[PDB]
Ligand binder design. Structure first.
Ligand SMILES: C[S@@H](CCCN)C[C@H]1O[C@@H](n2cnc3c(N)ncnc32)[C@H](O)[C@@H]1O
Ligand SMILES: C[S@@H](CCCN)C[C@H]1O[C@@H](n2cnc3c(N)ncnc32)[C@H](O)[C@@H]1O
Ligand SMILES: NC1=Nc2ccccc2SC1
Ligand SMILES: NC1=Nc2ccccc2SC1
Lengths: 294, 293
């Protein structure tokens, strides 16, 4: 849908039919990259140096990371899922080509290996070029990065492979469409070990509550014992907040209270957003959104 | 800023208070755009294809939309009065749209609320265009005055109010001195010994230095404790806004509700706030946690 025309007259305007009647705007200092890839329109620009945002990436017209606020969602998906697992040794990231979630996952010394599968090889290349603080772990020996559709990759992966699966996708318009669907989650269930955890890109409670509720229902019905939605503050996602559905394959698991608190881990002090109090607070939902958690 | 922010069928929230960014809402019809005695006030109906409904801006800053107004009004009204043991006399400085007053007046303990906003046109236009926000302005428990908040608290007795809620515009404009120490020395004085205050505490993304300065001077003026509560408001810049929730009495932990809303008859009519959201709001991202310790 959206491509180059979103930069016009000195600003980038995030106009999209997935959020009619609204658009966040950022002043453009310099366009660093702007081209169709094999799958998506990728735009990278340096924002106004008088403002805090730094370098900005958008896919299909939708802001994906900025320098200033990238840490939020990458620390919340990496730590909320791994700190809910008793011993997360093998992790899969679907999407995630900027490397941010992977960076956070590899702070855990329990992780033996993490596989990352993003459909768009140009996102990894441009993240290495323009966002080195986000992409700093893509070449780690504990990671294996492949370029491919995550729908096929989970269908091919054998049962009981992963302790945690993190699904860090673009929004549903575009190549991530089927990754918001029931067939994909049947496979995520299946490829988790019996005490596995998954979490995803759970969209906006202000814009997407119908889809978020639909997915919580079908994820429970595929066989996950518990699905709880965690909310976070991300200024450069539409309406300013994004969530993640955190799902436990096994019963008896309360993902809303950290099982292995980060504070007992050596890197808790390096984080800029997440800690155990923020983990517990993220599962408190506004009353209107409560029918995702119960 | 003023009328020039309505541009190309969009309202664009361009401001020197947040350089290089701007939230924009599509305009279906402008209903009102005029200078008041104090501020530029603009009211428009947003795109019916989107959710926002009618939108009000002052000095180019979005103040309320029909769709998300309830968040900040519930958080400031209930976080403060649910932290107080029996809040019977309340003062709202600013608040001329009536939203905070609507939430305060849910409380059966309130005997009287004074509301003092400098701009009488805000009350007039809120009655005309936001009836679900402004109904409360006519309530006989309220006395609604047009005047500056700083002069009002300077003529107010010691020990007048159980709760003071400071619902202002951002610091550029007529609210400038309401973000200053001298104003808060009066707020402390006009509170009763068990009093609570809360304010419009700006953004942890854009205004952290100011929030640090205010938290410090509020404590130094004599409040026993100051805790910042964060909330999700799409139509404030960067998507979140806070409130410094301050206790005159020592030994009070405002982060846990003292008088929980769920015991109250109107709990299930609220759209955002409950006792879990109250406790959660005091958890701050690590970059900002030093405001609360
Ligand atoms: C950039 S990341 C989100 C930003 C916060 N890290 C979203 C990634 O999802 C990938 N994506 C989209 N659809 C797919 C599929 N079908 N498979 C794998 N990866 C996908 C897309 O190429 C982005 O790099
Ligand atoms: C609209 S309300 C904020 C939006 C969410 N209820 C902010 C009010 O603060 C008033 N305001 C600004 N400065 C002052 C002073 N100095 N005194 C009282 N009220 C003030 C201003 O006229 C708005 O109506
Ligand atoms: N600004 C951001 N936008 C996103 C876009 C897509 C998926 C996740 C996010 S969170 C970071
Ligand atoms: N959209 C909103 N904007 C505000 C503007 C000024 C003060 C408080 C708020 S919170 C509601």
């Amino acid at each position: 849908m959206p491509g180059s025309e979103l930069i016009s007259g000195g600003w980038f305007r995030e106009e999209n039919d997935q959020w009619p009647g609204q658009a966040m705007s950022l002043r453009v200092e310099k366009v660093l990259y702007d081209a169709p890839t094999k799958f998506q329109h990728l735009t990278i620009f340096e924002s106004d140096p008088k403002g805090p945002w730094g370098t900005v990436m958008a896919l299909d017209g939708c802001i994906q990371v900025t320098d200033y606020d990238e840490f939020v969602y990458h620390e919340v998906l990496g730590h909320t899922s791994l700190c809910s697992h008793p011993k997360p040794e093998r992790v899969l990231i679907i999407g995630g080509g900027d490397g941010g979630v992977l960076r956070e996952v590899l702070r855990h010394g329990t992780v033996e290996h993490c596989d990352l599968v993003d459909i768009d090889g140009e996102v990894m290349e441009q993240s290495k070029q323009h966002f080195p603080q986000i992409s700093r772990s893509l070449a780690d020996p504990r990671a294996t990065v492949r370029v491919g559709d995550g729908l096929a990759f989970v269908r091919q992966t054998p049962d009981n492979t992963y302790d945690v699966v993190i699904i860090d996708t673009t929004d549903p318009a575009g190549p991530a469409s089927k990754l918001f669907g029931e067939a994909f989650y049947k496979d995520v269930l299946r490829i988790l070990k019996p005490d596995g955890i998954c979490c995803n890109q759970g969209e906006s409670i202000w814009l997407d509550l119908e889809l978020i509720e639909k997915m919580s229902r079908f994820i429970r019905e595929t066989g996950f014992a518990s699905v709880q939605y965690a909310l976070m503050h991300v200024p450069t996602y539409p309406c300013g907040s994004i969530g993640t559905l955190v799902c436990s394959k096994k019963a008896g698991v309360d993902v809303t209270k950290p099982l292995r608190p980060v504070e007992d881990m050596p890197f808790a002090k390096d984080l800029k957003y997440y800690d155990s109090e923020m983990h517990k607070a993220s599962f408190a939902l506004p009353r209107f959104a409560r029918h995702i958690n119960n």
